[PDB]
Design a protein around this nucleic acid. Structure first.
Lengths: 215, 130, 71, 150, 158, 129
RNA sequence: UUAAUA
RNA sequence: AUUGGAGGGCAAGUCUGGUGCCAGCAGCCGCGGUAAUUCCAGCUCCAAUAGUGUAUAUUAAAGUUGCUGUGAUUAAAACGCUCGUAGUUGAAUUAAUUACUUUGAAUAAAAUAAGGUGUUUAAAGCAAAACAUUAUGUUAAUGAAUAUUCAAGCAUGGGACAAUGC
RNA sequence: ACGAUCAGAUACCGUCGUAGUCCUAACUAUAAACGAUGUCAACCAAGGAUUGGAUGAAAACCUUGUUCAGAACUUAAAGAGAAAUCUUGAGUUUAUGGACUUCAGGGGGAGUAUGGUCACAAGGCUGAAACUUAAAGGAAU
């Protein structure tokens, strides 16, 4: 409640009815409550609880770092990282960060347009640190052929079928999820053949409702 | 040599570079038939001649009970563990035992100081059921 | 049944490439028509010149871009 | 880049986009052939023969006037030298370096460059033998090249 | 090889022995269909995997290939007569959408519980094993008997 | 030295499109380079091209329109049997609907789709998404 | 200027 | 109804009795110095199940042997540098062989894939029957087209990319 | 070889001093022989300056415009990488294939033993195995 930004005000007034409108014009989300309004009932799943330490004169300062993945099972996903002194708060802090880090997931078919969309449209590669995760489209029957760490994330994004090939120090849990989030992130940035058409001209929600937000 | 007719060097390079594989060279060169007390055999039989106790490594404390075995096929002298609790009292002397490996660890394994073999029978049934 | 695309992405008016949802440097200039510039073009120091070509194409400018550059 | 050192220069000539003789040129092939014919009899390399015509007679490209190259013209008249011009000049340098090396035995850079020069000769001699320009009985020898090159 | 006859496997053990996601999912199928052990689940997965592999092979071929037409029609015909695939779906792409529940819902144990001859899916197994249920003309005591559509209405007590 | 002129050309085109350039220039022109461009035009990956004659194996200028993700040549041109097509596409192309290979065959230089239709194999040249 | 070890 | 386990990898006990850096467990990290989640037992449940552990070896994992497919500044790894034969790779260009490619010929089965067939299902077998209530008739019944298949060899249509042309 | 210092000092400090350091002829063939970055070729973001040319202007030297070759330098929100950092590449690489050669496969044992070969010699080139061990190592906080 109590929005601060324009997009926060617009969604509270119920003028931006779909999250896809925000993704259409590339508007940054700065309040996690915006995602709560537009994507209700998001499933949750905490990837890991890694504890870091900083050496001090009096000893060590242990903080808990939480990797949480959020996203509805219909093509949206988000990954957020937060570290703090308490496990309960760190999850809550990473809970917020996951919501502002929502990204669209473009998925397609394997060989024909029959049924609903199940798999990625082309080959995508995550570009984290030494870890690199490749996703390949797969037929209908095959599940998410992947390690448990990115399988948990890919389940949330709604990708039912995929083939994976990982490379690097995949034992690094944080980079393993980050690499998957990166391959998914650029799904809508890779221009395939069907996206050649420029389509029509659409009005930005911040310009059509610029007057009301001022008043 | 990534050319279309460059198959001689590509095939010859893999022959030379494969000899640097520590795990693969060991299984090919002639050492399993001369430097392996067990040999190719999975299990071996021998005669117990001495009951030994080996101290463990520095971060551990205690005495690892074990036996000294003289194999039949070769005639070499080895050392063999005595699995679980109090199984050395079940092992007699100048009798036949079945000796069978361990995992392989970093080569040596579980009685610490260089032992790599574990007694699985005492003539009898098992230095398990026994 | 349901539409297979989440949304139809915008096309940069300069490089004719898609504008990613995470591209937080991509702008939209309204000339009382819509012009979209990708974030990569802006950071390179060229979006000013690229818009000059497009502005001259649509008539908003006449004697800015020379003929040999008018492509 | 160059064959033997890491130098990389692009100093070239630029043939114009006009394969025919220029309009202002009026000398026919008869004068061009005989003027070239007289130069060949004087003991001048084909590369230098064309330059003399270009500088003095304004015939910058001979193929644009006569339709055939200088070497083809010289072969028809039979005045082409038996040893190809580029190979001949290479054996002239190998002889000259060798003569200097007889008195200066301690020169280690001249020995290196003589090795590079002779490697060039064995590359050109091999090529010209495959092109049937030089008979297979030809062979470069230090004890012999001093006389034929002279 | 040493025997002139042929012997083939019917199931495969999973790659990762211990997962909590797999353990409860298998238990859901066991409870819903009253299976003896996980070996009966694995046979269904193997049988399904074979047909999925066949359909996947010919889907990569051209539509008018004689090889595809012969094998594709034969695979669909076998699926229809077994009752797994409803007759409306006559395209190979529907085989890939099959699940282990479709095959499990055609075992004789499932049908005789659905047909009402037994009170519970466990009572169906006992009734089948006791030579008490007849399919058309021959009694059956194997609950893994996959009934065809033509033999579906021919199930009655002994 | 220049071993593969086609490799030089396709690297120039891919580099130009990553920078967003409008048109690019290729110094050595060949029949094979022209055929590869014609295949890419039929799929509308390049607007058009012009060939200037320099009497010295002249230059080619190609106009690009925001559509060519990557065109790359394939080193030694393997003899691709008709049964090895889908093995190559599964490796080199992003999906089953997006890209296209290029093959040199006795019936000319064709992509994988129409070479399959004409029932002919040959050496593989390259691909483009 | 000299200053080793746990 | 047994086999193995209950600290992590790896599903399962921060239950109770003894043991006190001992006995031991421990494939790896490690647990045990008297309050043991890891020893020895009792109870409970975890996995598989008429099977389940152990030991050695093959394969996958191993993109840790690389053609697809690795790395070489600092982690291991660019010859001190140049010349050089075999080998490998070789600019654009033209309106007899070989290589390449498409079809075949010919080629033992068994096996692999795959067609049919209710061995009660199934692994099998290549037989049995579906109905003709079957001697009669489908019937002179099925034999999967059963396809493979690489490296060579034979024939055929094409000559783009290549080698020797001469 | 002396003299200091020190617990000792066969060393650092001071004095003397042989082989050597220098030239000629012949061996040796090794270096942190380093840009720790093989050779050739294509594409490639902004600069300012410099060395040697060519070409206009301004009266060899110097100030400027263009262009070719060379050793370098600065900026990057971009590309790459584990990072340091690289940008006349260490870029154009899971969207993996321009051509060729050499080398590496956890740390030790060990560049050791033996065998072969070269050298007057020291040594150089080629070069293991047994056994041992869960780490050794790289960049950064």
């Amino acid at each position: 409640w109590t929005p601060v930004t324009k997009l926060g005000r617009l969604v509270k007034d119920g003028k931006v009815k779909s999250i896809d409108q925000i993704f259409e014009f590339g508007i940054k989300i700065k309040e996690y409550q915006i995602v709560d309004h537009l994507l209700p009932g998001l499933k949750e799943e905490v990837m890991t609880m890694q504890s870091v330490q900083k050496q001090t004169s009096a000893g060590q300062r242990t903080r808990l770092k939480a990797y949480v993945a959020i996203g509805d099972h219909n093509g949206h996903a988000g990954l957020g990282v937060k570290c703090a002194k308490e496990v309960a708060e760190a999850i809550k802090g990473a809970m917020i960060q996951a919501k502002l880090a929502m990204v669209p997931v473009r998925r397609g078919y394997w060989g024909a347009t029959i049924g609903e969309v199940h798999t990625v449209p082309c080959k995508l590669t995550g570009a984290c640190g030494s870890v690199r995760v490749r996703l390949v489209p797969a037929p209908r029957g095959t599940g998410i052929v992947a390690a448990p760490t990115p399988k948990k994330f890919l389940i949330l994004a709604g990708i039912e079928d995929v083939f994976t090939q990982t490379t690097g120090h995949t034992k690094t849990l944080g980079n393993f999820v980050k690499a998957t989030y990166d391959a998914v992130r650029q799904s809508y940035g890779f221009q395939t053949k069907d996206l050649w058409k420029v389509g029509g001209v659409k009005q930005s929600p911040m310009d059509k409702y610029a007057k009301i937000l001022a008043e | 040599a990534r050319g279309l007719h460059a198959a001689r060097k590509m095939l010859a390079q893999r022959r030379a570079n494969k000899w640097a594989d520590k795990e693969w060279k060991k299984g090919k060169l002639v050492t399993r038939y001369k430097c392996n007390p067990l040999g190719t055999a999975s299990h071996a039989k021998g005669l117990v001649q001495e009951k030994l106790g080996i101290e463990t490594k520095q971060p551990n404390s205690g005495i690892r009970k074990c036996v000294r075995v003289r194999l039949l096929k070769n005639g070499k002298k080895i050392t063999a563990f005595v699995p679980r609790d109090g199984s050395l009292n079940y092992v007699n002397e100048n009798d036949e035992v079945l000796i069978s490996g361990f995992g392989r660890r970093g080569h040596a394994v579980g009685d610490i100081p260089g032992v790599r073999f574990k007694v699985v029978c005492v003539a009898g049934v098992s230095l398990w059921g026994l | 049944n349901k539409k297979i695309e989440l949304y139809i992405p915008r096309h940069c008016s300069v490089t004719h490439t898609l504008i990613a949802a995470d591209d937080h440097a991509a702008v939209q200039i309204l000339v009382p028509t819509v012009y979209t510039v990708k974030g990569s073009v802006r950071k390179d120091g060229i979006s000013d010149h690229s818009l000059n070509r497009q502005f001259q194409k649509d008539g908003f400018l006449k004697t800015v871009v020379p003929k040999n550059m008018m492509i | 880049g160059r064959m033997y050192n890491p130098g990389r220069g692009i100093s070239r000539r630029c043939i114009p986009y006009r394969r025919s003789a220029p309009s202002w040129l009026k000398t026919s092939t008869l004068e061009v052939i005989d003027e070239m014919c007289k130069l060949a009899k004087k003991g001048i390399a084909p590369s230098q023969i064309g330059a003399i015509m270009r500088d003095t007679h304004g015939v910058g490209l001979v193929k644009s006037v006569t339709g055939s190259k200088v070497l083809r013209i010289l072969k028809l008249a039979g005045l082409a030298p038996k040893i190809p011009e580029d190979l001949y000049f290479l054996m002239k340098r190998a002889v000259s370096v060798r003569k200097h090396l007889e008195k200066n035995k301690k020169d280690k850079d001249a020995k290196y460059h003589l090795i590079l020069i002779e490697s060039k000769i064995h590359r050109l001699t091999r090529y010209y033998k495959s092109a049937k320009v030089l008979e297979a009985s030809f062979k470069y020898d230090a004890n012999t090249a001093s006389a034929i090159v002279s | 090889g040493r025997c002139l006859r042929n012997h083939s496997i019917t199931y495969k053990t999973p790659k990762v022995p211990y997962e909590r996601e797999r353990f409860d999912a298998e238990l859901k199928l066991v409870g819903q269909f009253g299976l003896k052990n996980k070996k009966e689940i694995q046979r269904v997965h193997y049988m399904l995997g074979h047909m999925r592999t066949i359909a996947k092979v010919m889907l990569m071929k051209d539509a008018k290939d004689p090889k595809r037409l012969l094998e594709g029609a034969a695979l669909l015909r076998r699926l229809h007569n077994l009752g797994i695939l409803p007759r409306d779906q006559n395209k190979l792409e529907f085989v890939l959408a099959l699940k282990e529940e479709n095959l499990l819902e055609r075992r004789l144990q499932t049908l005789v519980y659905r047909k009402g001859f037994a009170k519970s899916i466990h009572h169906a197994r006992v009734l089948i094993r006791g030579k008490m249920i007849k399919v058309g003309k021959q009694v059956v005591d194997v609950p893994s008997f996959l009934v065809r559509v033509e033999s579906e209405p021919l199930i009655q007590l002994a | 030295v220049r071993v593969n002129v086609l490799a030089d050309a396709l690297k120039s085109i891919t580099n130009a499109e990553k920078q967003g350039k409008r048109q690019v220039m290729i110094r050595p022109a060949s029949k094979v380079i022209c055929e590869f461009l014609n295949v890419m035009m039929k799929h509308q990956y390049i607007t058009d091209y012009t060939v200037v004659d320099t009497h010295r194996s002249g230059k080619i200028v190609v106009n690009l329109n925001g559509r060519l993700n990557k065109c790359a040549v394939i080193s030694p041109r393997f003899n691709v049997t008709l049964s090895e097509f889908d093995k190559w596409e599964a490796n080199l192309l992003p999906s089953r609907h997006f890209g296209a290979l290029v093959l040199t065959t006795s019936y000319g230089i064709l992509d994988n789709t129409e070479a399959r239709a004409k029932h002919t194999g040959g050496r593989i040249l390259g691909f483009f998404y």
